[PDB]
């Protein structure tokens with residue numbers, strides 16, 4: 001009902017393309033191209049056009065986490081690791097824009113090349129799963145220039161959006177952010193999840209949020225539990241939908 | 251900057267599909283399917299997907315007219331005659347929503363089946379132009395159910411949106427609105443333009459806005475001048491882009 005509420009609601013419907021309802025790619029457990037409302041609502045399909053695949057439930061979660069951090073004065077930036085066409089990061093920048101927040105940045109981290117080719121340095125679960133095999137099938141490889149273009153279409157490409165192009169094992173250890181209020185992990189594999197927990201989670205502020213988009217994937221879950229056990233983290237894992245979970249760092 | 255400004259800016263980019271940049275139909279003077287920014291900015295193409303064809307310049311004009319009416323206390327509702335997929339009316343309802351206006355309605359008037367077949371009763375300029383020829387080529391026929399569906403996708407289908415299905419010569423004389431603050435005419439022909447000026451313009455409040463979307467079309471322009479001459483209307487005709495004009499009613 002307020003201007004902010006209307007803007008953020010529309011931005012969610014737009015980045016997920018509930019407006020025009022694009023077909024999905026046929027891959028994984030999706031056997032037909034037709035737009036299905038329930039699949040887009042819960043982020044389960046592979047949009048041919050939409051700027052995010054995370055769906056409405058995970059967009060609502062991202063809004064909750066960012067708004068809570070702002071409300072509670074939790075310091076730091078927003079980082080997404082694994083951005084595809086950029087829609088979740090566009091939405092995050094839009095939240096900051098709606099509240100006229102000028103002192104936080106959205107960090108946009110990706111290979112900008114899709115999933116990595118498997119080698120003998122990969123975890124066996126990642127090697128077996130071989131996510132790389134799906135790159136073309138779901139149009140995953142999306143260049144930095146394309147993602148920048150997408151931000152610009154919403155009027156949200158500015159100096160509060162910064163990009164971290166490369167493999168997370170290479171980009172995360174020396175990424176230039178000092179503090180995070182929201183760490184959103186969407187890289188699917190054991191490797192991508194462990195890379196980012198290892199190298200970015202220590203910069204997550206107390207009261208900040210750690211979102212695991214791909215917790216339904218066994219390899220991803222494996223990394224989450226290994227990392228939490230190592231660090232003695234017992235913060236409640238709260239389920240969002242059939243894919244994602246999050247916790248709030250105590 | 252403000253939530254309202256951000257919402258309405260996004261709503262314009264969305265109904266015109268600057269976000270996903272759908273191809274155009276190849277028709278009229280548009281010779282290629284590719285999205286062209288300048289063509290969508292000025293409302294010159296025939297979107298395959300977008301909910302409005304009027305473009306950013308005419309969306310900005312609609313915003314200016316509605317906001318001015320609200321600011322100045324001009325009484326009445328908003329009517330668009332010729333809505334296609336509904337996007338300009340969706341945007342109008344969004345403007346009212348952004349300002350929490352609860353006492354005005356957006357009236358959505360169309361045949362919901364494209365241009366009418368020409369008959370012997372048509373003006374000779376309309377007969378020659380024969381807009382009916384283009385219906386399928388640019389996917390013009392769009393049912394009431396489809397337009398309602400489109401409103402719902404934005405969360406804007408509610409009791410402040412009312413529909414007037416049928417030919418304007420049938421629906422306008424007894425349309426139930428009492429007063430208009432904005433009258434947006436987008437029916438292309440002499441006939442549709444004269445139908446709406448004849449039967450809806452008298453309900454346009456002083457200080458209200460009359461928008462002629464299709465003024466570049468000779469038959470439409472003919473109707474505009476005939477009507478203005480008949481009624482002694484000399485309110486300045488202000489050009490928006492390469493298609494549309496508007497005036498503000500002084501009397």
Ligand SMILES: CC[C@H]1OC(=O)/C=C/[C@H](C)[C@@H](O[C@@H]2O[C@H](C)C[C@H](N(C)C)[C@H]2O)[C@@H](C)C[C@@H](C)C(=O)/C=C/C=C/[C@@H]1CO[C@@H]1O[C@H](C)[C@@H](O)[C@@H](O)[C@H]1OC
Nearest residue numbers: 027028029053129131134138186188213214216217218243
């Ligand atoms: C198509 C791409 C996708 O691929 C699959 O969806 C693969 C699915 C396999 C076919 C599945 O196997 C089948 O299950 C059946 C129940 C039984 C079958 N049989 C034994 C006969 C068996 O063949 C699955 C369960 C295999 C397991 C290991 C799995 O969870 C894999 C995930 C892959 C995700 C990838 C990557 O998409 C990512 O996904 C996460 C969850 C999203 O947020 C998002 O980031 C998205 O990126 C855009």
Ligand SMILES: CC[C@H]1OC(=O)/C=C/[C@H](C)[C@@H](O[C@@H]2O[C@H](C)C[C@H](N(C)C)[C@H]2O)[C@@H](C)C[C@@H](C)C(=O)/C=C/C=C/[C@@H]1CO[C@@H]1O[C@H](C)[C@@H](O)[C@@H](O)[C@H]1OC
Nearest residue numbers: 277278279303379381384388436438463464466467468493
């Ligand atoms: C394809 C549908 C469209 O068709 C045309 O765009 C036809 C164009 C003709 C080809 C044109 O002719 C050409 O001009 C050249 C200058 C010279 C050419 N040659 C002699 C060399 C001649 O061939 C035009 C100028 C003909 C004149 C009579 C005209 O203005 C017709 C309008 C028809 C509009 C219709 C209906 O679309 C409506 O359009 C108005 C302007 C929009 O807001 C919108 O509501 C839209 O609905 C969605």
Ligand SMILES: Nc1ncnc2c1ncn2[C@@H]1O[C@H](CSCC[C@H](N)C(=O)O)[C@@H](O)[C@H]1O
Nearest residue numbers: 052053082083084088110111114167168186
């Ligand atoms: N090790 C790694 N390093 C960098 N990027 C990676 C990676 N493994 C996967 N990726 C990227 O992780 C993404 C997974 S899909 C991300 C979906 C996105 N958050 C949305 O809103 O739709 C892809 O863009 C892929 O290129």
Ligand SMILES: Nc1ncnc2c1ncn2[C@@H]1O[C@H](CSCC[C@H](N)C(=O)O)[C@@H](O)[C@H]1O
Nearest residue numbers: 302303332333334338360361364417418436
């Ligand atoms: N005589 C008549 N009566 C009712 N509707 C008519 C008509 N002549 C044309 N129309 C309608 O006028 C419209 C012209 S195109 C309208 C474009 C629309 N305003 C937009 O925002 O894109 C079509 O939807 C067509 O069905």
Ligand SMILES: [Mg+2]
Nearest residue numbers: 119120121122
């Ligand atoms: Mg090796």
Ligand SMILES: [Mg+2]
Nearest residue numbers: 121122169191
């Ligand atoms: Mg690795």
Ligand SMILES: [Mg+2]
Nearest residue numbers: 186187213214
């Ligand atoms: Mg994911």
Ligand SMILES: [Mg+2]
Nearest residue numbers: 371372419441
């Ligand atoms: Mg007639």
Ligand SMILES: [Mg+2]
Nearest residue numbers: 436437463464
């Ligand atoms: Mg027109």
